[PDB]
Amino acid sequence: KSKLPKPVQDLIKMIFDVESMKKAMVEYEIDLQKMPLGKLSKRQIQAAYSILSEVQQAVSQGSSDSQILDLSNRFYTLIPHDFGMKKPPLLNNADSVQAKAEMLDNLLDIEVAYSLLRGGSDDSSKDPIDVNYEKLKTDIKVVDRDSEEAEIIRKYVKNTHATTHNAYDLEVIDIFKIEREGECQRYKPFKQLHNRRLLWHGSRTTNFAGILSQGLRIAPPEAPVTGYMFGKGIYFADMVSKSANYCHTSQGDPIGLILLGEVALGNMYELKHASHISKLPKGKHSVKGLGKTTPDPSANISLDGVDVPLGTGISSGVNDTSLLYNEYIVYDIAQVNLKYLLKLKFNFKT
Ligand SMILES: C[C@H](NC(=O)CN1CCc2cccc3c2[C@@H]1CNC3=O)C(=O)N1CC=C(c2ccc(F)cc2)CC1
């Protein structure tokens, strides 16, 4: 019978929920019959990634228009879809592969979750909830609702909700202090690096077994580049709202998980438009996508040598940028130390 607190157990249940994995594969219009979660293999997901890479290649660099067809065919063969009577869309443009790349990105973390979940031995003195918690290799302490942390974190949530993301409201349900096994040592060199900021990373609940057990990761070479305004990196926002939208919560499932991450931003390569450099200029350690609105500098609180940008949104200088709001990207997974995981309730508009 579990030691773990009520909120933590609920979290463990939530991220190891086989049904949410299933639901999300359905949303992506995968064929569950030809492919169950058990069959979901790491090998094909990486193989299917390579096929995605063979497309995008060709297309505007080659393009046989019948080899493209065989490729699209090798894809849905590998990852069986179920459009029913409609046939799958041929993978013949960038926008087309972005969508299927993003999906593999999720199946990857889903495979991680289910692998984790159905792995291990049942010594069974401790109930599965204890077991599954230990599979995450992360310490998770509940942050007291009435503390100073909790109030700053809630202020960060309240103040940085964007003017144009008003399709819902955010209520913090639980706040977790998190410590990934080994991440301190990993982050250790970047701790001396200046300009360190507590920033938002939103993702779907089905990625958290993966995110907690392995950290925020970077897309490998086998993957495309489309949609990536600043390359293959780990992205963050200073507005809870920019990040929440990537939880992919609906009126039907209104509860989301978001991360607070300390990120060692160093000298930021400040940008206004999508240049895929990926290789920074020397003495630059991150990219900051400049936006029209920014959190308010006069309120950037500092704790334990780390900037919390809980200024409410005001006019940034920036003129002639495509960016909604700011956006921070690093290209080395070690520049990130996860600090908090928040259970968010999305209270949907009207
Ligand atoms: C590029 C991709 N980004 C996204 O899916 C969405 N994000 C980009 C835009 C953005 C901007 C500001 C804040 C956020 C984002 C989001 C992620 N959530 C953030 O709050 C990404 O960084 N991933 C991390 C790990 C990827 C990966 C894929 C394959 C693999 F083998 C290893 C890692 C999958 C997705």
Amino acid identity of 201?
H
**Ligand 1: which of 44, 112, 235 to mutate, judged by most atoms within 8 Å of the beta carbon?**
235
Q: What is the resolution of this structure in A?
A: 2.7
Q: What's the fold here for domain 1-136?
A: Poly(ADP-ribose) Polymerase; domain 1 (1.20.142)
Burial per residue of 32-61, b for 16 or more beta-carbon CB atoms within 10 angstroms, e otherwise: eeebebeebeeebbeebbebbbbbbebbee
Helix (H, G, I), strand (E, B) or coil at 168: strand
Q: How far apart are CA 205 and CA 286, in angstroms?
A: 27
Task: Give the other-Cβ count within 10 Å of 214's Cβ.
Answer: 15
Q: What string of DSSP letters covers 79-97?
A: S-B--STT-PPP--SHHHH
Amino acid identity of 226?
T
Q: Does ligand 1 lie within 6 Å of residue 256's CB atom? A: no
Active site residue 327: yes
Q: How far apart are CA 70 and CA 91, in angstroms?
A: 10
Domain spans, the chain: 1-136, 137-349
Q: How far apart are CA 33 and CA 48, in angstroms?
A: 18
The dihedrals phi and psi of 342, each to the nearest 5 degrees, come to -110, 130
Q: What H or E segment, with its residue span, contains residue 149? A: helix 148-159
Q: Is 203 annotated as a binding residue?
A: yes
Count how many Cα atoms sit within 13 Å of the Cα of residue 230 in the half-sphere of its side chain.
24
Q: Please determine, looking at this structure, whether the domain spanning 137-349 carries the CATH number 3.40.50.1820.
A: no
| d(CA 203, ligand 1 centre) in Å | 8
Q: How far apart are CA 104 and CA 114, in angstroms?
A: 15
SS3 percent helix, strand, coil of the chain, rounded to 5, is 35, 25, 40
Q: What angle do CA 13, 14, 17 make, to 5 degrees?
A: 80
Is the Cβ–Cβ distance between 159 and 311 less than 8 Å? yes
Q: Does ligand 1 lie within 6 Å of residue 4's CB atom? A: no
Helix (H, G, I), strand (E, B) or coil at 280: coil
DSSP 281: P
Burial per residue of 110-143, b for 16 or more beta-carbon CB atoms within 10 angstroms, e otherwise: bbbbbbbbeeeeeeeebebbebbbebbebebebb
Helix (H, G, I), strand (E, B) or coil at 176: strand
Method in brief: X-ray
Q: How far apart are CA 79 and CA 31, in angstroms?
A: 8
